[PDB]
Ligand code: NA
């Protein structure tokens with residue numbers, strides 16, 4: 051079975067609504083901002099990709115009350131609220147709103163998160179220390195459980211097929227998409243709402259990454275400059291929040307119901323480094339293998355790939371590992387155009403896979419390849435890779451690859467083809 | 472492809488080592504104990520299924536130093552340490568210890584958890600409130616991330632195929648097994664180490680369930696009596712901790728390498744209620760559909776099922792929902808023998824799926840069906856279901872079904888056949 055995407059939804063540091071987000075992205079916009087002191091006051095990591103409200107962003111702000119009654123918002127952590135908005139958008143685009151149980155039973159919901167309800171969990175622990183555990187809300191556990199993003203989406207739309215929640219860090223929502231494709235192919239679902247949601251900002255989660263020296267600290271006075279994948283002066287990732295969702299279904303199923311395919315999913319590969327608990331190997335060999343499996347599934351030679359939306363999160367070691375992996379798969383001197391949109395959004399962790407898949411699909415749809423903001427002095431190790439600089443590249447393209455290479459050595463790559471071919 | 476299990480590992484409230492655990496189970500033993508005041512002092516829920524150390528249980532105690540150097544234990548939360556011990560056991564039984572990269576690249580690691588590193592997370596939040604976030608360990612994030620159970624297992628054994636971490640609550644490690652089977656069938660792995668691990672005891676997590684009135688409170692003076700699935704006087708679940716793992720591979724692959732199949736996996740189904748965020752529907756319709764999908768995959772009529780290891784966690788509403796679902800699938804007056812081993816272990820949450828799959832497989836291997844401890848007055852709604860009382864039933868059987876029906880409306884059922892058939 052050929053598998054397609056028929057709808058996309060985004061909640062991001064560049065706004066809500068995928069067309070608005072895409073436009074801001076391609077026009078050179080950034081979602082990086084100074085974090086509140088309540089989150090970053092004690093840390094030298096001061097910058098984040100934050101999702102703004104409608105007071106701050108009238109056209110593209112995040113208002114979860116449009117998706118969920120105010121009363122029910124109290125029952126769900128921020129990442130879930132974002133998941134709900136993004137899912138509404140993707141499902142509206144796809145026109146998938148089954149009323150009959152037959153089709154509801156064939157709809158799967160697969161929504162990843164790397165950290166899940168960290169703010170909710172942290173608050174509950176703080177209440178325990180101050181007020182006592184006897185004082186906890188009855189909604190405490192489902193407020194934060196990672197699977198309640200998919201859960202609340204399923205409950206709203208009455209999706210009664212398989213539910214999934216892959217919690218595999220920065221690869222998580224790349225796996226959500228591969229998992230969705232797999233279920234369409236095994237016949238376990240006809241439609242999958244697949245994606246990721248992350249809203250993990252808290253002094254302890256940021257503090258935790260900061261203790262690992264994982265975060266950018268050198269650009270607090272000019273936040274937009276902090277995320278600089280592949281750049282000589284990168285000094286750690288910039289945490290981001292948001293959600294992105296795709297509707298995945300067979301081409302036959304899409305055409306039978308009159309849904310227009312936005313792009314085709316032609317390959318997926320996932321591997322484990324089995325090397326170290328947070329850092330990948332210097333040669334990028336696990337990431338290399340995952341890319342090759344995606345290409346092999348797609349029957350696509352490396353030289354046929356037009357665009358790669360790299361994982362590169364702006365870490366000295368991580369970006370260098372992916373550079374090595376890209377060189378191994380694609381060679382040097384020709385090969386695909388390569389950029390990291392984390393330069394603009396920051397690192398959405400479990401939601402990075404889905405938003406970067408959305409950006410890869412839109413690159414194909416419109417013939418525009420996002421640039422890498424802040425790429426002022428590329429790493430000499432990348433010489434010979436066609437790294438796209440800060441300005442987007444307007445060129446017609448047919449095949450795009452997107453990578454997610456996460457903590458615990460989890461690597462996932464997904465490959466898309468423009469529709470029609 | 473026919474899919475088999477070739478090894479099993481268990482860390483549980485009845486001990487470590489699946490043969491010891493099985494023996495204690497079938498002899499009528501309980502893992503329920505009074506919790507320390509540091510966990511349950513402020514709560515009227517005082518009983519848990521706890522994993523004991525070797526001082527307390529010389530023959531079956533938990534000693535993670537046999538799996539991991541003391542130095543490296545500091546880098547991993549309790550659930551991960553349990554996952555490591557259980558995985559070592561299952562892999563030793565299966566004799567799967569690939570040295571060549573070819574076979575390492577074909578080994579997947581799929582390990583579920585419902586809550587993951589709650590104790591680690593809670594401690595980090597407490598340190599943040601007392602010492603400051605500047606004081607956090609550099610290991611803070613990977614210490615608790617749910618995917619680091621599979622991650623650490625992968626790193627030790629050099630498993631370089633797909634990594635998964637389904638965080639779908641009480642269904643989670645039933646899904647891990649279904650997901651493993653799916654990958655063998657798609658050709659994405661030749662061997663999968665699949666299971667779940669949970670070690671979530673903390674005053675806040677217990678406090679959270681207690682706030683939902685989800686926990687047993689009426690049997691603190693006789694802890695062994697607290698978990699009583701299907702019984703008239705059940706008053707909420709008893710939280711448990713542990714890990715269980717299975718090695719999953721094709722029958723052809725097992726026989727080619729001289730590994731002995733312990734049982735065959737013949738069916739798997741998973742559904743979503745799309746009804747409410749913690750409670751299932753009163754008619755058990757999502758659970759019903761998941762059972763039917765497993766049976767349909769196995770080409771097994773309801774009347775051919777010999778044994779069901781029920782989800783039933785000892786809740787008034789949950790156990791009644793599963794009763795309704797069982798009646799729908801199997802009818803009344805004949806049907807399978809049905810028990811819940813949560814009566815003895817408590818509710819292992821994300822690890823329940825794997826330990827109860829292990830118990831179902833051993834039931835088939837040895838012709839012994841575990842009883843339901845504490846079943847003194849069965850729910851009248853179950854009249855006509857063959858509920859097994861407190862004593863194990865010694866009968867030869869061929870087909871077993873095991874259910875996991877979790878928070879967020881996630882239902883999963885897995886179906887096994889005795890080997891040879
Ligand atoms: Na990417």
Ligand code: NA
Pocket residue numbers: 780781782823827828873874875
């Ligand atoms: Na069960």
